C-alpha cells in the first residue's frame, strides 16, 4: 500500500501573487479562481495543501512548480510531506 504525499505551497514575501496563481494553473491544472484561493491560503497562513498523490508524482510536481519560480529569480517553494 503506497503512502500518499501532500504537495505543500509555502509562503514568501517576494514571489508575485499572480505568478503563484499561473504556476498553480499550469502545473496542477487549477482554474483562475481555485488558483487565487489556494495561493491566498498560503499567503495568510504560511502554507497550503495543493494536492495529495503518490510520492514520486508529488516530488515531480513540487520540483517543476518550484523550478518555475526559481529560474524566474523567485524563492517560490513547493515541498512534499507525508500524511
Ligand atoms: N508577493 C507576496 O506578497 C507573496 N506573499 C505572495 C505569495 C502567496 C503565496 C505563496 O505561496 C507565495 C507568495
Q: How far is the CA of 1 from the centre of ligand 1 (A)?
A: 35
Give the CATH number of domain 1-83; options: 1.10.1530.10, 3.30.365.10, 3.30.1390.10, 1.10.1040.10: 3.30.1390.10
Q: Rounded to whole angstroms, how far apart are CA atoms 58 and 3? A: 11
Residues 39/65, Cβ–Cβ less than 8 Å: no
Which of 7, 9, 12, 41 has most ligand 1 atoms within 8 Å of CB, for mutation? 12
List the domain boundaries for the chain: 1-83
What determination technique applies here? X-ray
Which DSSP string do the residues of the chain spell out, in sequence order?
-PPEEEEEEEP-SSS-HHHHHHHHHHHH---HHHHHHHHHHHHHHSEEEEEEEEHHHHHHHHHHHHHHHHTTT----EEEEE-
Q: Rounded to whole angstroms, how far apart are CA atoms 73 and 14? A: 10
Query: Which value in Å is the resolution of this experimental model?
Result: 2.8
Amino acid at each position: 500500500r503506497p503512502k500518499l504525499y501532500k504537495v505543500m505551497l509555502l509562503n514568501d514575501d517576494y514571489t508575485p501573487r499572480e505568478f503563484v496563481t499561473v504556476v498553480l494553473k499550469a502545473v496542477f491544472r487549477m482554474s483562475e479562481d481555485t488558483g487565487r484561493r489556494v495561493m491566498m491560503t498560503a499567503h495568510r497562513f504560511g502554507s497550503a495543501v495543493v494536492v495529495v498523490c503518490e510520492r514520486d508524482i508529488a516530488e515531480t510536481k513540487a520540483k517543476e512548480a518550484t523550478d518555475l519560480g526559481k529560474e524566474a529569480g523567485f524563492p517560490l517553494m513547493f515541498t512534499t510531506e507525508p500524511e
